[PDB]
Amino acid sequence: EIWMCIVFAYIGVSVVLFLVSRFSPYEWSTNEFGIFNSLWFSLGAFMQQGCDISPRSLSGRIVGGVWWFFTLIIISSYTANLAAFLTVERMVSPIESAEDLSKQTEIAYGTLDSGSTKEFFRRSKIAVFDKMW
Amino acid sequence: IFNSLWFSLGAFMQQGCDISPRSLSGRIVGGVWWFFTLIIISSYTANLAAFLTVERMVSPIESAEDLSKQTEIAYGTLDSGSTKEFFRRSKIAVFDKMWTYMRSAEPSVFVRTTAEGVARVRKSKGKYAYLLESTMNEYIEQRKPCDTMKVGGNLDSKGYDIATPKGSSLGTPVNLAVLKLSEQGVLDKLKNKWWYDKGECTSALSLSNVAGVFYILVGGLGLAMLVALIEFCYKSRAEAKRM
Amino acid sequence: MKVGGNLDSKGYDIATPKGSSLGTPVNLAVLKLSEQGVLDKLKNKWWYDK
Amino acid sequence: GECTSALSLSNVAGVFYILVGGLGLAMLVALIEFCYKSR
Amino acid sequence: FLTVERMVSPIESAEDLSKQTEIAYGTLDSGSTKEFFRRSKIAVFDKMWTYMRSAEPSVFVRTTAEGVARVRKSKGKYAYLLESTMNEYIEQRKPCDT
Amino acid sequence: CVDLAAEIAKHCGFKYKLTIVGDGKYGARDADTKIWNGMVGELVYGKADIAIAPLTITLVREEVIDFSKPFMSLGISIMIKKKPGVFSFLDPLAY
Amino acid sequence: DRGVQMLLTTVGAFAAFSLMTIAVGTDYWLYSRGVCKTEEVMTHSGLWRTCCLEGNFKGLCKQIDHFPEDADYEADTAEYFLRAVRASSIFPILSVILLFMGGLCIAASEFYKTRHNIILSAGIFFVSAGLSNIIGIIVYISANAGSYSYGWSFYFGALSFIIAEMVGVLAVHMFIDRHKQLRATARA
What we know:
The structure is cut from a larger assembly and holds 6 copies of chain A and 1 copy of chain G.
Chain A: H1 2-22, H2 35-46, H3 58-87, H4 98-103, H5 116-122, H6 127-132
Helix pairs in contact in A: 1-2, 1-3
Chain G: H1 2-25, E1 30-34, E2 41-45, E3 49-52, E4 61-63, H2 77-88, H3 90-109, H4 117-143, E5 149-150, H5 152-187
Antiparallel strand pairs in G: 1-2, 1-5, 2-3, 3-4
Helix pairs in contact in G: 1-3, 1-5, 2-4, 3-4, 4-5
């Protein structure tokens, strides 16, 4: 969800920057912030790779500032979470109960060919046990 | 003034700049601001990393041994009963140390009644734990307001049985009836009915963690659009009225 | 690894022939051993300590 | 026997002091240059 | 790397030695130390004794010199329990590897 | 307990009358006069013929009354009491 | 080409409006295990109700409760405000409204060739619509904070946002082209 929202926010920021930079006829152009140039500027700002051009109007600079703050927060969060992942190893258990086994189908499970466990499973009145059998 | 504000904002975010100071004093200001920005951003990233790392390594109490080791969360049984005797005569190291903590503890973690114990656990916001029968714990956990949870396995083993006067004709038939009920699963069905059927009760960063930055970004986009619209409208009105 | 709780309840008991004098002594001995927690001690010794 | 927090301003006060000192030094240098040029 | 390095704590007590299993530990094959470990009730003592009995390969050592050599050639995977005075004497002997 | 008693009666083919213990106690020997109380005491003095209740199987009760095989196992267990803010990205640095 | 571009804008506006209306209307926003018509069953939940899928009560739809006042817990006012905003579904509805206004402005621009300020307005609405969509998406995901997979209605809404942004860009291009042509004509 974070990645998809990042993509959508990048698209929206590029479109808004292009709109606020070019729509006014009085700007015409004095600036170089076309749609392709807006996309390039937003991509460069997200990767913290500088920019060939920077907005000069108040609205374009507001867009650039909010995009820069978003980029800073997101990149810092990515680095911090990667560090947390690499520092502490967490081992998950795919199966932790019988109903968990019943709901899934990837992991096989079985009992003795003839014994107390199999006969207990064959004749049961519980939904989970019935599904397992 | 506007260009200086833009330069400072770009320097703090460590992004591209269309201008740079050329005089010695302007370059001194730029250098000190750059050092401040570097230190602040590195500190923020490191503190977020420490936050997430400490959050990741948090281990909730899951066993009796974990409860025995840590002493932050208090725990105690009833003031009497079979739990007292079990803890007193338990020679296992974990249970013995649990009992030693229990008797030598201030304030007294002991409780008068089971209802008082569960109420104290509820009002202790996780600071006080209870040690009680697994069946009673399972019954309590399945009641409103859905705040108590049984954690870990049983410390000992006990059972409930059907009682008969010694030397009676109802003993063995009742024993075989109980065994048969156990075999066909009627006892399990009754437990499910009276405990669960009639009850009343990750690692990756989520979008909820960084929703505020998205809200701020969208608000800034809207504000920029409004400012551009206001400037365009004012220029249009000025042009129309001029000629 | 063992995951989850027990699916049902079963027990291991000491078997004694019907109509013999050892049965009730044995039942009382089993209950006494369980009460003192010694059965837990043998289980821990022969399961986890070893 | 009976017996992470957010970074505070005290942690980074030194960088703030250095920033303000640099601002003051830059102001002093600019004023000195202006006075020299006026003279 | 730096955080994992900073949280590594060396063994500084018998309890820390007992809690872990990475560095093995044992006493003399037949001596007063073995009898003391067998005859104890203090929790750490019987935990270490249970480690002794279940250890394989055997952690017991026939003589003090062999135990010191076993500690020395294990590069830190073995620990020796012995008399404090004799151990302090050996630590102050060449080539300072204990 | 009511359903279990109904099942036991159906298995044994008998009719039963339910009665609550007078003192509301499970039952324990009193060392001062060696007098049994509770449901076990009720059985000892013959007031009732069978107890179907959460009666723990203990040696002190087994030596004086008979116990069937356990119908429900239990043990000592631990009971414990069990969302980020919108602007939680400012948390690493104080306000 | 002016005609080709206008055709593209009309088609894109219609597609975005239809996709957003379908996303708001239908129920295939998310797949999750939950209760039905109030056991746990794999149902599909949308913006107003959740309906069972291959369940005992399959086909039954129950309105999703956005106020978990069963335990009467309030916490902070931020959670209450977020729950109210999600329950009202104000932002997807506002995105639909803005897309409709943009389409209406697009249609009305063909009547008055002289006044270009309409066409720009249309683009703004489209852009605004997209912003609203984004906010709604965030809110929706935030609503899921307090296994799960996203249904085709969610992807329809995302596609609607993308198409609305594209239509806004092309409408701004129309405004720029019209003003540049007017300047070129009036210069002589």
